[PDB]
């Protein structure tokens, strides 16, 4: 219920019609301090990119092994039946 309410609130806030952080960077090649600041979104401003780019559907999950009972081969009388 908590996870689904988070998902519902995220979906509604995405569909709703309309602080600076400090992080430590280790470059692994000493450490740095980075002030994460989000730029202000202009409310007077249209969407930027075309999103109607249709591509064909991707590959699915790898297929499950198929359990079956051993196959009953139909007779020829069954074949004209």
């Amino acid at each position: 219920r908590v996870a689904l309410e988070k998902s519902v609130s995220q979906k509604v806030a995405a569909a709703m019609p309309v602080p600076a952080q400090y992080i430590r960077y280790t470059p692994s090649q000493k450490q740095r301090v980075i002030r994460m600041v989000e730029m202000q979104k202009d409310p007077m401003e249209p969407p930027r990119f075309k999103i109607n780019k249709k591509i064909p559907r991707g590959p699915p999950s790898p297929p499950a092994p198929v359990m079956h009972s051993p196959s009953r081969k139909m007779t020829v009388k069954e074949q004209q039946e």
């Binding site: 090649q29 740095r32 301090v33 600041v37 591509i55 991707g58």
Partner: protein, 295 residues
């Protein structure tokens, strides 16, 4: 009808040491879906910052999926481990990976690799890093060690080129003469630099690396006895024996301080060739650097 490329929204950009600058305290700006990727054309989280005092306000160009795919910087488009173009690293390791060029196939391949990465641990440059275990062939010879800050230099003032920059010293752009437009080094397609196809910087560094015989040796007429200079009395026969013990069995290991030469010979031709290639201006033992040649 319900397949499209997902928008890559993530923090913590993957940058080089050189483009990040030198100050430990960096003030950083983030747009959620600011610009598009310069390769895969998807929208992505755009990071912008000033690397230093008189720099250019460098910003990220390609998306995080492409940069995690090719293990490169998001701005410099150079390799994170070595600071080299990806054409040079592909010539060093493997050039059979490739990528599609048509936009629908590129978007489909990028969506498949993005789904593969998101189904993976999250930060791994696929199995290509598994092909990148073998290293230090020749790429470490021409790799930079110092941070080359001159590519964070600001752009050339086009008004000053026509001699009309009225700002003068207030103008943050460079008031100096540009490079030669007739030079073929000045073309530099971004997609060519990403795909590793006919990049002139990569061709110039490959021609520079091909003219340095750091692994050639073989200057003797089927004789395994090679002389390593620069050793002297600082490096003795014990360091030469410890270097030749990795190759197997050594026929003769000696050091002479009169000519400052270490004579190394092996019973096997391949072991002697490996010992000559390892000691050709790349071996340092007991504080003494050795250069392998005929003796």
């Amino acid at each position: 009808t319900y397949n499209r490329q997902n928008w890559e929204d993530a923090d913590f950009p993957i940058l080089c040491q050189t483009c990040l600058g030198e100050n430990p305290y960096i003030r950083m700006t983030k747009e959620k879906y600011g610009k598009e990727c310069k390769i895969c054309a998807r929208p992505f989280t755009v990071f912008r910052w000033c690397p230093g005092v008189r720099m250019r306000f460098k910003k990220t160009e390609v998306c995080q999926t492409c940069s995690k795919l090719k293990n490169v910087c998001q701005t410099c488009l150079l390799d994170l481990e070595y600071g080299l173009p990806i054409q040079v690293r592909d010539a060093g390791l493997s050039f059979k990976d490739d990528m599609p060029k048509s936009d629908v196939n590129k978007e489909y391949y990028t969506q498949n690799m993005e789904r593969e990465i998101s189904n993976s641990d999250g930060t791994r440059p696929v199995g290509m890093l598994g092909k990148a275990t073998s290293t230090s062939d020749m790429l470490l010879k021409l790799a930079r060690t110092t941070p080359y800050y001159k590519r964070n230099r600001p752009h050339i003032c086009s008004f000053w080129v026509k001699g009309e920059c009225k700002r003068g010293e207030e103008c943050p752009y460079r008031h100096e003469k540009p490079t030669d437009p007739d030079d073929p080094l000045a073309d530099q397609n971004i997609k060519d630099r990403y795909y590793g196809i006919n990049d002139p910087v990569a061709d110039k560094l490959l021609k520079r690396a091909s003219t340095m015989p750091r692994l050639d040796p073989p200057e003797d007429k089927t004789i395994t006895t090679l002389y390593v200079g620069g050793l002297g009395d600082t490096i003795t026969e014990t360091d030469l024996r410890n270097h030749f013990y990795q190759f197997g069995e050594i026929r003769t290991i000696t050091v002479v301080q009169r000519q400052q030469c270490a004579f190394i010979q092996f019973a096997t031709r391949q072991a002697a060739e490996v010992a000559a290639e390892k000691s050709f201006n790349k071996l340092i033992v007991n504080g003494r650097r050795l250069n392998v040649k005929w003796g």
